[PDB]
Amino acid sequence: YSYTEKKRIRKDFGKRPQVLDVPYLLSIQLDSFQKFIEQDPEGQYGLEAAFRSVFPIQSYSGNSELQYVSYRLGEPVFDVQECQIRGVTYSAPLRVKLRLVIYEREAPEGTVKDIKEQEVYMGEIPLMTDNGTFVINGTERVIVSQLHRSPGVFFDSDKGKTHSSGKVLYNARIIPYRGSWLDFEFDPKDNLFVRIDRRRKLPATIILRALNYTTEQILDLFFEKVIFEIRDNKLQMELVPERLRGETASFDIEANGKVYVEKGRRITARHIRQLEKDDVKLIEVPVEYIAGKVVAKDYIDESTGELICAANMELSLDLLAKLSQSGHKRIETLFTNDLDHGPYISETLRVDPTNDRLSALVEIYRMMRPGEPPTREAAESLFENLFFSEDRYDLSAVGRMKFNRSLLREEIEGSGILSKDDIIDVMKKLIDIRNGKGEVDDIDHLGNRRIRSVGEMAENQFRVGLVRVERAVKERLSLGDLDTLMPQDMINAKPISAAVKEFFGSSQLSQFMDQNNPLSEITHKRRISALGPGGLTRERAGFEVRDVHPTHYGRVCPIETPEGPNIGLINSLSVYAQTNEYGFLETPYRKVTDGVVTDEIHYLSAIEEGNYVIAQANSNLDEEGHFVEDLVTCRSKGESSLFSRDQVDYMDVSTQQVVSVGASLIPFLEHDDANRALMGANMQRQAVPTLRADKPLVGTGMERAVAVDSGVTAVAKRGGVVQYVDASRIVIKVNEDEMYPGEAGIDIYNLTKYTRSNQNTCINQMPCVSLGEPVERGDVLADGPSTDLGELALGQNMRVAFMPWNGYNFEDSILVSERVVQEDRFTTIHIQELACVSRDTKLGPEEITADIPNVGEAALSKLDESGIVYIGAEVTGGDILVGKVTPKGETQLTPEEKLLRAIFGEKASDVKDSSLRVPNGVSGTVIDVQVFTRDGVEKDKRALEIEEMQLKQAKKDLSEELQILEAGLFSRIRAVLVAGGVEAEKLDKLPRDRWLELGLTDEEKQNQLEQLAEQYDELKHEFEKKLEAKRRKITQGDDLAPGVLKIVKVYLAVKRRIQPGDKMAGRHGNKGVISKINPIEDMPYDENGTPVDIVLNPLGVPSRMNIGQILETHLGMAAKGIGDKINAMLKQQQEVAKLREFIQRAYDLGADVRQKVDLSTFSDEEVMRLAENLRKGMPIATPVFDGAKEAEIKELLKLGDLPTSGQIRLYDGRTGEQFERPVTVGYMYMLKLNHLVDDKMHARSTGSYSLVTQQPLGGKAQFGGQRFGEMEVWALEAYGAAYTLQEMLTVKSDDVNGRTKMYKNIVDGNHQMEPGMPESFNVLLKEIRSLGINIELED
Amino acid sequence: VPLDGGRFATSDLNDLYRRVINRNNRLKRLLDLAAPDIIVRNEKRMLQEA
């Protein structure tokens, strides 16, 4: 079966056999950054592509060149953990091998004079840890992926949003990856207009004249010509028949045969069929047929050299009789059939003022740089650098692909710059769409919208840095010292490092990691964000980008999204969702070849998802594969309908394909409303890890995937046997099958003990395996925070009853019994670092000392002689943690305290107490103290003590891992030596250091002895190489901020118990604040006396229709009911046959469930270990949308001898009398969310005030003051509370002379105010007067 | 105001006032030096925009 998952097997109620296992959930981040940093030979991705994009850098003249050979990534100076402790970025140095090639002065082809190649250093790039996070200035950050608009061309419209006339106005838009936007559009009178960078619009033919097209070439491109070969007969007209489609023929058509349609009729396609079947191509038209027709060619008089008719000029009868004198047989004319063809280009050329290339370039220049006089070689360089220069415009590979795919070209690859035919084809497709021959694009289709991830954004910022360097190198190669300099005298690392640094630290998408539980991390890494640089802004994003498109099915979760202002802008990647090679989300589907649903899987993106018919995952099918129903529900084009079995092309790969990893953990998701499911998926990510992790009795089976794919747990890399288990480490003796030759064969796993998360929780790894037991590859070795035997345990299985209890659960409140506080269920450890920074003031240095002025001697009891607290010291609020004093001067005390000094003689001290104290309300244990001392500052006794502790710990850990590895190497040597020439009773006496030089006869295994001895010697060498480095990193100085002398960081560990106010929740959106902690004897209780742990409200179920929280309860009653039977069989010490029988009955139960747990193969010891793990309730798995039916829940309730209705009779704890109706009692999985009332409660009487305005400061960190804002002032104005309002304005915020008087009056027993003018009004009168305006106060 | 970390924190008004006074003293300088009209016109425009 397994070994870690037959300790305790979760009974699966899933019924559809899974075809694709859930992928590695963090492969988005890791695959993206791997594509960024790794070496690319062909130069397509990451750093190699960014170097080849810029290099070789040629000089302005061409005498020297700077080319790029290769790059390398250095070794990071500090480990991940050393970067988290020293508060520095975990990065790697970028060592680029450059080459300066210099020629002679006059060379034939650029023949070289010298080549100077060397390894320049340009910046450090932050490395990504093996869990997808970045350690940047010590904090772990996640660069959230971005859903942005794919580069390409997009045709769209406004649906009569303009001119109030119902005329849809179309617009094409070329969006490059990097470059300038290019818009074409139709105005309400069908004139094509162009815009660049969304500035004011030109006529669209101005850009056609910027290209070298003349007017007749423009009309040749955008039209087809009708030709009048004016024969003897009046205007003998050449004709193709289909031009006659759908118009009111007021002229008759006669050509050697019938008069086809009489004058004054509209003609139909059968008339065109008639004209093409009798084969007439040359007809006779009336004379006025040219009146209105627009000429196509520039008709000139060869007699006089004068153009008698310009192109795009409306031919008339007088002008026709004019040019007919010149002897012109053929008259070309633009064929404009209304409602099939447009005058748009001709009526556009009638508007623009330009008639040649230079005038159009000048008009584009006046559009672009207005008020600057345009010259020829300035305008004709501006236009050529807008769209057609490969360094100022990039329609990238995905942009070129989408561009060619829109215009229906055959190639997917091309150039990154625009061309003549690209712009012509965009205008042509826009005109086609205007003529009804196409349809506008959907801008929020997930095939018009793509994923830009950490490894692409980082490459973009690195390329920005490289071009900031390229400009400087071009400014440097234009000098005359080119014969003495090396390429590292030209490269400033600060541009590159500053670009990469600001992206990784201070971007909108590089976010402080949400580290509450494993789920918070694993769903912050799978985050998609429409916001960010190059995306939307949450204030200007409409209702339509925030919607659930039909193309999010399988690519983006519909449920998991925020609830505030950015909803639908922050999305969560669904479970099986993947990215294309271009960044388009694709999702897997099983091919259905002939009705047999093949287990072959194909990842379809959103554009190719609509060509097919795709069956549901809920579609029934036999073992053969055919759909047993005959009308399968499928998705054809974005709409859903029933199809025959033969039409179906693909099928969903799973039922949790559509929901994210956060919403796939909600059991019975199919019974909750989508609002409540959204709230539950958002509130699971806020649960804090409790002391002892408790698995869900009702889960969905995704617990193990979420707990393993997040790096919170310790997973065995190679299988083996646990050689040594300990709360701080696990030592695994690897199996002989899995160890390489020349290797100790021992894996050591050092566990994270009691460290601070980003959200001040405790992350702490507990060993799961026992000593000597066998482990496999992939088995969870040590739990993490919120992890129970490798499953994801975000909360505790509290026994709930749904009944109203005396109003204490009114309006979503939670009644909690005292046995939840007794049993320490939702007690959570929280770790806070507090920093005491001894700085260098200008009056002198602040010192960390224990002789603090005017403080008690009992307050300094917990400080050591160096002024710092002891480790293990139980501190409460106000206690001094780090004793510090700042030197002060210029006292200038008032005469009364001067006399007070004269009488008693206590002379004031020159120093001020600035020590670090525990914040009020916080009470915990000091668990760590770090002292960072600036180099040159002498270390106090505590810093030297901490350093000797660190050196002893480093030396002891390195020596212990060397002892472990060398013991494994010697065990392997002993195993090899007894494989042939066995000295097993001679080798036990020979000491271990003598076994290397023991020559064995060399059949083959002497090569093994060579490699093991070499491994041992290099292990001994590496131990010293690591120990000296650890010693020099410990005893070295710290690179602190300038001005600070030392920093003492005290790590408090608080234990927050549950209390009224703490927000608790379930997985189904049923949040609630604890309103009372009720005694055990006050709770309702069943006929056996078991009281109820938590009493929830029935009224919170039916209106917000989260029925899942009922079924989870009814099934959690069933699960625990199984456990309460196994526990009973474990108390009577029943034989293992009866336990095996009952556990097999509990695992066999269900209607054609997909799992088979056969306990016939379990040994009796494995059955007993399983039954001991199941005595607290059998964990049940209800997968999302194929989970447990209500009939199966009732069958499980019958198995555990429970009432199948899920409802028992309770009795009141206080009065002992039975509640009149049966109450729903069961086991709901409750979560303690991170909104704790300890961190919410805050109050001030007075305190620090603001600087410019004298109002109180902001928040509970700055001691607060509540904003009595504008709506509350209207509330006090709606009552007649004029004095309450006045004292809220004057003597509580701003009346500086008035609030001190108010305090002294409240103290002297006189509740009276003397309000003056608020200081903000004086600030306002002084700020209006600093404008040229005289505002006054009259009297 | 000096922040505790040794660094200072100013309002944008000091930057704007300092720009005004720099351009104004330079305009008085140019008017004393009898600069050409192109330079003093550009300086008057800069003082107006500051």
Binding site: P370, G371, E372, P373 | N42, E49
Partner: peptide, 15 residues
């Protein structure tokens, strides 16, 4: 001419 088309004093200086 270009008089009155711009507001940037840099452009007026270069003009």
């Amino acid at each position: 001419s270009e008089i009155g088309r711009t507001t940037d004093p840099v452009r007026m200086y270069m003009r």
